[PDB]
């Protein structure tokens, strides 16, 4: 059985005959009474602990003294942004790529007329209005952004190295065994 | 899902303003029928003719409202006010707070400290 | 909202986008045997609608002052003969305007306010909002108040179902057991008196770590404790698990299937029950839960026997967490190690004048909270504990909403209490595990 | 024995049952959303991701054929040609029939595929069983009645409804083979999903939804643009 | 005392001594990079899919902002219920929040949970005084009773909503305490009257009032501007030099 | 419900077992359901606890175990020259959750800062210890008292003639306590 | 019931109202608002004082039609109660 | 005000095996008189009153019913038409 | 209070002290003196007790207060 020796508990312990009589009559004589041990429980009491003794901790960058300016460290302030994208600028992105992927070249002048058109025309016409005249195609390269199937949304583990969903899977040991209604799962 | 309670009604727009006109006869009769029923179970010792008075002040405070959304808040409030007191949620000091059983001129509020 | 004025468009409704069942395929008329005439309108002649409203149920107050109310809930019950035809909890009678209060305090004057509301789950109450305030703050607390954070979340978990799991057998009729654990929670508020001075209300759990460092012998008498508890769940296991007459009360009772549990809103061991593989703390790993190595007790039947033999489990899996925890604790700070944030020792703050300036503004002024919004949301013992914090960039919130597991579960008590009796529902109230400091707010 | 799933048997999620023929009903469920979309434009990109998702997961529930089926197929043409009079929903209802305590069955169409749905009359125990399981209309009208009376009881159902017993002009259905549990897997291996029940529960709550997104016209502009200062917060100037 | 034959008293190990401590500055912002294109692509995609309602989206760390028109609740909603890629089958939960400057005083936060992805969303709309919302109480049995706390709360209606009544404050309650202007204290409060024997209402006195020390707020701002952690894929083109 | 992605092996739970199926004997199922033996389990367990040592002590002879960290009720402390502490720099006022501290100070008649008011309404405080945290001269501390029940609330509207007759009775133990706890503060 | 007893009883009443202009233009073919001085919440209240006294109840639907005493009659004597 | 009574057809039942037991009580007390010949008689009459109670068994008139079926539409694929 | 315990305690107190701890008490207790308070309360350790018993007072009033 998956239980431990009484011997080992921290409990208080029956002795000799009643340790004989004990053993003899309860169901489990590794149980426990529950009643925890004078000399080791709490002794000695936190209020006579000596204060010397605790040392109050400083990690080496942060607190040293000669190898940290604040503003290196100051992650309050290097907080981010939240990054928000209109209908204005998504028929924008669709029309001429982003600086990662971009759809025509927009080699020097000439280029930066294009540029703002391709602003002015989501602010003057929106998503639905510019997959309208573009046709079905440009919908098809929507789902071209997502290699042609829709995207995924994030799970929010990252326990493999990546952010996922959390694989469940049932557990190498049920407690309840196969018994009980209860399934263990890791 | 959860069943809603007895006077429970679902909350739905005014299509026009016929239908707020009746909605709201509608409200002001189911209170005024009501007032009987009232009064036993929350034991008022006033008359009924008392708390018919306070139901139709009620509705006289928003007797100049020509607002269709206004309106459909206020029969929004009044239906649940409505259930809350004949499901017996509240109490008689509630049912009594209910009932009040500022100074008349500037002269009277000055010589009392303002009112 | 000016054309709102007269008649205009009507908004859209969900009766509106209702759509007509296929009837090639359709099979039934209710796939559901929690609307199968067990509710209102199974009787009678007419109904309720016209020529109905002139006649009541038998209607009973089941509290607030009622054992099995456990406190302040005014459950109103309609009783055909002794059968439950609807069910309708009134709450508020907690409800003391938190939300509000926290408002008009600073980040550090509100957490004391996480305390009280789960209110048996306090350090877990406290971690919700610690770890909203740090997102909000992009700041990374240490690796010794993530283990102290983590085993005290445990500590908090046994301590709750405790009570939870002890005051549910009470209600049914069993006495015994509840008195046993009380002698264990009594056991563990030591552990938190001593590393806060509060028994209940420690707050310890702050935004930035936790508020003082463990004493020197705690540690230790932790892990005393830990050899001793696993006896201490076997004998009341040893009264419930197999008793014919728990079985009986519970097996079968407050069922509620799993595609139903999510829609509920349900969370914790109420959607865990239904045969769901979900925890808070295996999906979005906080502090160091993915450190740890735990299970996750799943039911199968969404009964009030399943959650509690998943509750029963969840006993044995934090004890376990507890003890690697005790194994695992590294040395270090217990504060994130900027004083523009947690204050500086009281030693700094005598001798240094950087360390003065700092004190002085973090508890007058507060810190600022960088301008954002957040939900944040961790497995309390009671199901998904989350908070929607708003942040002005000031020291105070601009808002703080508080989503209590058990306001989610009362509100779908109806659904699957009507047409049990009276004491099903007793048996409901419990495995449904409400606090109505959460419920209320 | 362990061949095949037990339909109805507990999945070990609560209230959902093993589906009696789970393969046939993603087909059904995915042929009859590919039939929906169609009235929607096909600039939508709603219409390219459903119609894009449900493909990719239609072709792989093609791909794990049961043992035999094409015989079975063989065998079930030759069955509704000679014999389309007994499936045709036009003449006995899109239930099969009137008669629940026998078989029933009719032949459906989604995109021009041709199902065939049936109701075996529900199994229950013999000592609670009464007349075979038919439905109890209640007590014939009797004595002094108006006819309109007589023809509200149902009395045009004496000249149309059957004898479960009288079997010579209709032919029994054997349905569809099924998918060894082996195969349940491997399909929802590939679908990954969960199990095939949840993979079903999801397609139907799909195919309803595009009702839904066709009435209210998702494709078209923007009904409210937000006006000045609605989406600011308390944001510091970059 | 009787004390156990193998538990040590453990107090009495010693500890090897810990001195010099290394701890690495992290930015805990850093890790949800990973996920940023995706969290950008997604909500890109639904704004395509749906661009009757959508009006923007916002992504933060690992939360992605819906923000939609009022009239396209139910629409929307709907499909994050039921489609493939969007199985947002939970209502976490329904808030409102007050914005007194704006002219749609209030904002309607619901968050939804997909246990199916492992994913979370935000769809956030707007209403007033007077404009109401419609109810999600079709598509999802557990937003009753968020409804009726942002009813009570804040006071907004939710048309089509079954039993909307208040569900927090007190039966005879007047106001909706969430609000802004609301005061903190609110307006009335009660006592047991020993002429009435009852519980009656009064007009609110405090025998200490309450102390605002919002005007020790800090003159100096403490926060800054933060960073842009846009992405370059969701980021418009430059213009190459010549 | 379950995790998107292959679904967890193992996960369709084995199909149903009938009752001729069931690997129990018969003269154990029937023996078991007559002769009550799980109960009787139960029963047996009551009677081992029942010789088992009580929980119990005898408060107020005996009393439970409280740290140097527990929060009672509060004091105002001196230097050892019985020279006030506090300052009046208001910070726990501040700070407090619950105002309910009222500080009114001016300049002593020596020139030195000092309170003139100090209430602590005891029916408003929440006894979270963030007042003794702030102080920069350690005078405000919580007790480890928590025996001072009282007939009317009156009696808990503490002034600084209440407060300094608190640390003057108490600083002995005060002293032992932050002398306890001040290395971890 | 008998036209004459459900009509004498309805001038006692209309009459014993507070605040109608005057208690002669009570006929039967009288109009609560043209006639009476009856406002819309005068007359709510007046059908149901009316229904009250025959302690019978009047439906939404046909409660608005009585606008006048005689459909008040007619009404009274098409619904069985007394 | 008028109540429902889920478990009145047990206080019906009640009732008549309540006169049963007691029509038993006097043979407890004449066992050695009546003997066999009397033992027969005893029988027969418990037999019949036995009968009953199966009635009452078999009907579930002793049940009191309490609580808050499978799927049965197989679809077949024939492909194309 | 059990048999050996009780009669151990009554055995090395009197018999006219248990009668005393009966009164005040209701236990048998034994222990060494630690001191005295500036009321008259006395103080009692015994390590060899239950745990939270090992320290206790007798109090040196008769209407005996925390
Ligand atoms: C002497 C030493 C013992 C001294 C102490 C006695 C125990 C005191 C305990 C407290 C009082 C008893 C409490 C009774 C609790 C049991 C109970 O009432 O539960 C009801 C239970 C429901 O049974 P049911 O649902 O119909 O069937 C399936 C059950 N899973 O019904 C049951 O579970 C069945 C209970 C059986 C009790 C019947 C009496 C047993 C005596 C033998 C009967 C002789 C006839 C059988 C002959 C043997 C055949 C092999
Ligand atoms: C072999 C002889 C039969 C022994 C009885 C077997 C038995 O326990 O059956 C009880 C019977 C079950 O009937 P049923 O409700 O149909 O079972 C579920 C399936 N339908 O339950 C019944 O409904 C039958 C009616 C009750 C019969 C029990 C007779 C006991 C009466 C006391 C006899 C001693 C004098
Ligand atoms: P006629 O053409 O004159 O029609 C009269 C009316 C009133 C319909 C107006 O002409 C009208 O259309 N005005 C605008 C609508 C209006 O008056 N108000 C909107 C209706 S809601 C309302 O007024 C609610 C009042 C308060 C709640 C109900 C009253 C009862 C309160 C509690 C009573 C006692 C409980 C203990
Ligand atoms: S913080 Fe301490 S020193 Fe300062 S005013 Fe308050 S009590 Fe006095
Ligand atoms: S411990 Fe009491 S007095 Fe001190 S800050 Fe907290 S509530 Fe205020």
Redesign the interface.
């Known amino acids: 059985s998956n239980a431990?020796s009484i011997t080992?508990?921290?409990?208080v312990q029956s002795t000799g005959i009643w340790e004989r009589i004990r053993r003899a009559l309860v169901?489990?004589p590794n149980?426990?009474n529950?009643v925890?041990?004078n000399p080791?429980?709490?002794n000695?009491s936190?209020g006579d602990?000596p204060p010397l003794?605790?040392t109050?901790?400083?990690?080496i960058p942060?607190?040293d003294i000669a190898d940290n300016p604040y503003w290196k460290?100051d992650?309050?302030?290097?907080?981010?942004r939240?990054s928000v994208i209109a209908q204005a600028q998504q028929v924008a992105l669709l029309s001429v790529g982003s600086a990662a992927q971009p759809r025509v070249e927009l080699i020097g002048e000439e280029g930066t007329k294009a540029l703002v058109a391709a602003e002015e025309e989501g602010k003057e016409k929106g998503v639905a209005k510019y997959l309208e005249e573009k046709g079905a195609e440009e919908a098809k390269r929507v789902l071209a952004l997502t290699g042609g199937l829709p995207p995924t949304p994030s799970?929010?583990?990252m326990?493999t190295g990546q952010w996922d969903?959390?694989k469940?899977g049932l557990?190498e040991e049920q407690?309840?065994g196969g018994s009980?209604?209860?399934?263990?799962?890791? | 899902?959860?069943?809603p309670?007895?006077?429970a009604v679902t909350v739905?727009?005014?299509?026009?303003?016929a239908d707020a006109k009746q909605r709201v006869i509608a409200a002001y009769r189911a209170w005024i029928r009501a007032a009987p029923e009232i009064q036993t179970m929350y034991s008022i010792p006033f008359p009924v003719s008392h708390i018919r008075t306070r139901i139709r002040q009620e509705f006289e405070r928003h007797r100049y409202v020509?607002?269709?959304?206004?309106v459909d808040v206020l029969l929004q409030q009044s239906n649940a006010d409505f259930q809350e007191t004949m499901?017996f949620?509240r109490q008689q000091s509630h049912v009594m707070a209910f009932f009040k059983e500022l100074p008349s001129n500037f002269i009277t509020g000055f010589l009392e400290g303002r009112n | 909202?000016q054309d709102?004025?007269?008649?205009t468009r009507?908004?859209?409704?969900?009766?509106?986008?209702?759509?007509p069942p296929?009837?090639?395929?359709d099979?039934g008329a209710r796939d559901?045997?929690?609307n199968y005439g067990?509710?209102?309108s199974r009787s009678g002649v007419d109904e309720?609608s016209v020529e109905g409203?002139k006649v009541?149920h038998?209607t009973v107050n089941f509290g607030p002052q009622h054992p099995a109310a456990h406190g302040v809930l005014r459950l109103?019950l309609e009783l055909?003969?002794?059968?439950?035809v609807?069910?309708?909890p009134?709450?508020?009678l907690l409800?003391r305007?938190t939300?509000?209060?926290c408002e008009?305090?600073?980040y550090?004057?509100?957490l004391?306010?996480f305390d009280r509301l789960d209110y048996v789950s306090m350090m877990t109450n406290e971690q919700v909002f610690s770890l909203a305030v740090?997102?909000?703050?992009?700041?990374?607390i240490?690796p010794?108040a993530k283990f102290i954070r983590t085993m005290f979340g445990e500590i908090t978990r046994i301590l709750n179902h405790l009570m939870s799991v002890l005051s549910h057998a009470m209600d049914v009729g069993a006495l015994?057991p509840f008195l046993?654990g009380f002698?264990?929670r009594?056991?563990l508020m030591?552990f938190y008196?001593?590393?806060?001075?509060?028994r209940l209300?420690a707050?310890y759990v702050r935004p930035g770590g936790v508020?003082?460092?463990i004493?020197?012998?705690?540690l230790?008498?932790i892990?005393?404790?830990a050899?001793?508890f696993?006896?201490?769940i076997?004998?009341t296991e040893?009264?419930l698990?197999?008793?014919?007459?728990w079985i009986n009360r519970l097996k079968?009772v407050?069922?509620?299937?799993?595609?139903?549990?999510?829609?509920?809103?349900?969370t914790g061991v109420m959607l865990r029950?239904?045969?769901?593989?979900?925890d808070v703390r295996?999906?979005?790993?906080y502090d160091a839960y993915?450190q740890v190595?735990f299970?996750?007790?799943?039911?199968?039947?969404?009964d009030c026997?399943?959650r509690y033999?998943?509750r029963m489990?969840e006993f044995?899996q934090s004890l376990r967490i507890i003890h690697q925890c005790l194994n695992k604790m590294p040395?270090?700070?217990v504060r994130y190690?900027?004083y523009?944030?947690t204050?500086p020792?009281?030693?700094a703050?005598?001798e240094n004048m950087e360390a003065?300036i700092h004190?002085?503004?973090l508890?007058?002024?507060g810190?600022?909270?960088?301008?954002?919004?957040?939900?944040t949301?961790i497995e309390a013992p009671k199901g998904?504990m989350?908070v929607?914090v708003?942040?002005?960039?000031?020291?105070?919130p601009?808002?703080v909403?508080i989503?209590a597991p058990g306001?989610?579960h009362?509100?779908?008590?109806?659904?699957?209490?009507?047409?049990?009796?009276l004491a099903?529902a007793v048996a409901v109230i419990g495995t449904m595990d409400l606090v109505f400091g959460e419920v209320?707010? | 024995k362990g061949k095949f799933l037990v339909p109805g048997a507990?999945t070990?999620?609560?209230?959902?049952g093993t589906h009696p023929s789970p393969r046939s009903?993603l087909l059904?469920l995915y042929h009859?959303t590919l039939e929906k979309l169609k009235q929607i434009p096909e600039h939508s990109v709603y219409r390219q991701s459903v119609e894009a998702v449900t493909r990719h997961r239609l072709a792989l529930v093609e791909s794990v054929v049961p043992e035999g089926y094409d015989a079975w197929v063989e065998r079930a043409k030759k069955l509704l040609e000679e014999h389309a009079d007994q499936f045709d929903?036009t003449k006995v209802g899109?239930?099969g029939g009137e008669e629940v305590q026998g078989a029933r069955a009719?032949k459906?169409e989604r995109d021009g595929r041709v199902?065939v749905?049936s109701?075996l009359p529900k199994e229950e125990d013999e000592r609670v069983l009464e007349w075979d399981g038919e439905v109890d209309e209640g007590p014939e009208l009797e004595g002094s009645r108006t006819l309109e009376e007589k023809i509200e009881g149902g009395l045009e159902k004496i000249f149309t409804r059957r004898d479960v017993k009288d079997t010579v002009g209709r032919v029994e259905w054997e349905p569809e083979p099924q998918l060894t549990a082996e195969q349940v897997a491997e399909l929802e291996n590939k679908i990954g999903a969960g199990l095939i029940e949840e993979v079903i529960?999801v397609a139907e709550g799909e195919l309803?939804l595009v009702?839904?997104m066709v009435?209210?016209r998702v494709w078209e502009p923007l009904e409210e643009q937000p006006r000045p200062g609605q989406w600011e917060?308390?944001?510091?100037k970059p | 005392v009787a004390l156990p034959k193998d538990?040590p008293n453990?107090?009495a190990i010693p500890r090897e001594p810990?001195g010099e401590?290394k701890?690495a500055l992290?930015?805990?912002?850093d890790k949800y990079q990973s996920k940023a294109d995706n969290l950008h692509k997604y909500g890109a995609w639904l704004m395509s899919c749906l661009p009757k309602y959508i009006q923007q989206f916002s992504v933060?760390?690992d939360?992605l902002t819906i923000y939609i028109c009022?009239?396209?609740?139910?629409?929307v909603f709907?499909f994050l219920k039921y489609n493939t890629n969007a199985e947002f089958?939970?209502?976490?939960?329904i808030?409102a929040?007050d914005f007194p400057t704006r002219?749609?005083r209030f904002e309607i936060?619901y968050?939804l949970?997909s246990?199916r992805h492992?994913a979370?969303i935000?769809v956030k709309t707007y209403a007033?005084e007077?404009?109401?919302?419609?109810?999600?109480?079709?598509?999802?049995?557990?937003?009753?009773?968020?409804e009726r706390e942002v009813y009570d709360?804040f006071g907004v209606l939710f048309?089509?909503h079954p039993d909307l009544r208040?569900?927090?404050?007190?039966y005879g309650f007047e106001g909706h305490?969430?609000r802004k202007d609301?005061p903190?204290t609110g307006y009335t409060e009660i006592r047991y009257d020993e002429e009435k024997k009852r519980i009656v209402v009064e007009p609110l006195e405090l025998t200490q009032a309450?102390r605002?020390?919002?005007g020790?707020?800090?003159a100096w701002?403490?926060?800054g501007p933060?960073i842009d952690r846009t992405p370059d894929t969701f980021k418009l083109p430059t213009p190459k030099p010549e | 419900?379950?995790?998107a992605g292959p679904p967890?092996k193992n996960f369709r739970?084995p199909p149903p077992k009938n009752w001729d199926e069931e690997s129990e004997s018969t003269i154990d199922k029937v023996g078991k359901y007559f002769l009550?033996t799980?109960?009787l389990?139960?029963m047996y367990?009551?009677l081992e606890?029942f010789f088992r040592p009580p929980?119990t002590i005898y408060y107020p002879f005996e009393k439970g175990?409280?740290?140097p960290?527990?929060?009672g009720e509060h004091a105002l402390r001196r230097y050892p020259s019985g020279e006030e502490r506090c300052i009046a720099?208001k910070?726990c006022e501040?700070?407090?959750?619950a105002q309910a501290i009222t500080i009114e100070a001016e300049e002593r008649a020596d020139g030195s800062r000092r309170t003139t008011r100090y209430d602590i309404d005891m029916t408003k405080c929440?006894?979270?210890?963030?007042c003794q945290?702030?102080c920069?001269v350690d005078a405000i501390v919580?007790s480890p008292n928590a025996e001072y029940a009282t007939e009317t609330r009156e009696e808990l509207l503490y002034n600084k003639e209440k407060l300094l007759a608190n640390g003057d009775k108490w600083e002995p133990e005060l002293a032992a306590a932050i002398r306890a706890d001040?290395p971890?503060? | 019931l008998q036209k004459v007893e459900v009509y004498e009883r309805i001038k006692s009443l209309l009459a014993g109202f507070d605040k109608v202009n005057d208690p002669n233009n009570i006929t039967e073919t009288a109009h609560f608002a043209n006639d009476l001085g009856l406002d819309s919440l005068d007359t709510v209240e007046v059908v149901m004082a009316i229904e009250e006294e025959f302690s019978i109840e009047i439906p939404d639907k046909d409660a608005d039609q009585i606008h006048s005493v005689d459909k008040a009659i007619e009404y009274i004597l098409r619904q069985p109660d007394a | 005000s008028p109540?429902?009574?889920?478990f009145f057809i047990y206080g019906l039942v009640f009732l008549l095996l309540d006169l049963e037991i007691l029509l038993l009580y006097p043979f407890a007390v004449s066992e050695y008189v009546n003997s066999a010949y009397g033992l027969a008689a005893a029988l027969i009459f418990i037999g019949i009153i036995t009968i009953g109670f199966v009635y009452e068994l078999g009907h579930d008139a002793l049940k009191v019913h309490?609580?808050?079926?499978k799927?049965?539409?197989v679809?077949s694929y024939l492909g194309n038409i | 209070s059990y048999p050996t315990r009780t009669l151990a305690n009554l055995r090395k107190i009197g018999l006219k002290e248990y009668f005393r701890q009966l009164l005040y008490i209701g236990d048998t207790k034994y222990g060494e003196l630690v001191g005295v308070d500036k009321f008259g309360n006395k103080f009692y350790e015994n390590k060899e007790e239950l745990p939270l018993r090992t320290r206790w007072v007798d109090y040196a009033k008769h209407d005996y207060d925390a």
Request: a negative charge; hydrophobic letters at 30%; glycine letters at 8%.
């Open positions: 431990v080992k508990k921290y409990t169901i489990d149980r426990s529950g925890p041990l080791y429980n709490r000695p936190p602990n003794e605790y109050d901790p400083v990690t942060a607190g460290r992650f309050r302030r290097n907080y981010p939240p799970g929010q583990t326990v969903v959390h469940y557990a407690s309840y009980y209604p209860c399934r263990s799962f890791v | 899902a959860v069943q309670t007895k006077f739905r727009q005014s299509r026009n303003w020509n607002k269709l959304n206004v499901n949620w | 909202p709102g004025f007269q008649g009507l908004i859209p409704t969900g009766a509106d986008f209702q759509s296929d009837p090639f395929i099979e559901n045997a929690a067990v509710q209102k309720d409203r009541r038998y109103i055909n003969g002794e059968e439950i609807r069910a309708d009134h709450v508020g409800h305007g939300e509000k209060l008009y305090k600073t550090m004057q509100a004391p306010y740090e997102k909000l703050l992009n700041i990374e240490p010794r015994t046993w002698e264990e009594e056991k030591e008196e001593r590393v806060s001075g509060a209300h707050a508020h003082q460092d004493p020197v012998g705690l230790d008498d892990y005393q404790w050899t001793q696993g006896d201490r076997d004998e040893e009264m698990t197999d008793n014919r007459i079968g407050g069922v509620v299937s799993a595609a139903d549990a999510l829609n509920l809103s349900f029950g239904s045969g769901v593989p979900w295996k999906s979005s790993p993915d190595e299970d996750v007790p799943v039911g199968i039947n969404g026997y399943d033999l998943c489990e044995r040395a270090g700070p190690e900027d523009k944030i204050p020792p009281r030693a703050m005598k003065l004190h002085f503004l508890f007058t002024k810190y600022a909270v960088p301008p954002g919004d957040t939900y949301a998904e989350g929607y708003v942040s002005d960039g000031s020291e105070r601009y808002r909403h989503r306001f989610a009362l509100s779908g008590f109806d659904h699957i209490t009507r047409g049990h009796l099903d209320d707010r | 507990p070990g999620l609560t209230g959902l009903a059904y009859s929903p899109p239930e009719v459906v199902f749905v109701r529960q309803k009702d839904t009435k209210a917060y308390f944001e510091r | 538990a453990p107090r810990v401590i701890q992290v930015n805990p912002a933060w760390k939360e009022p009239t396209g609740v139910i629409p709907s089958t939970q209502v976490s939960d808030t929040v002219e749609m936060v968050n949970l246990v492992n979370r935000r007033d007077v404009t109401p919302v419609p109810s999600i109480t079709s598509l999802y049995m557990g937003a009753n009773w968020y709360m048309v089509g208040r569900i927090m404050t007190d305490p969430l609301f903190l309450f605002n020390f919002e020790g707020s800090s701002d403490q926060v933060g | 419900a379950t995790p967890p739970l009550m799980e109960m389990r139960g367990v009551l606890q929980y175990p409280i740290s960290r527990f929060r720099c910070l501040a700070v407090c959750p929440i006894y979270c210890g963030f945290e702030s920069p919580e001040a971890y503060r | 109540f429902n009574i889920s309490s609580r808050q079926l799927s049965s539409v679809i």
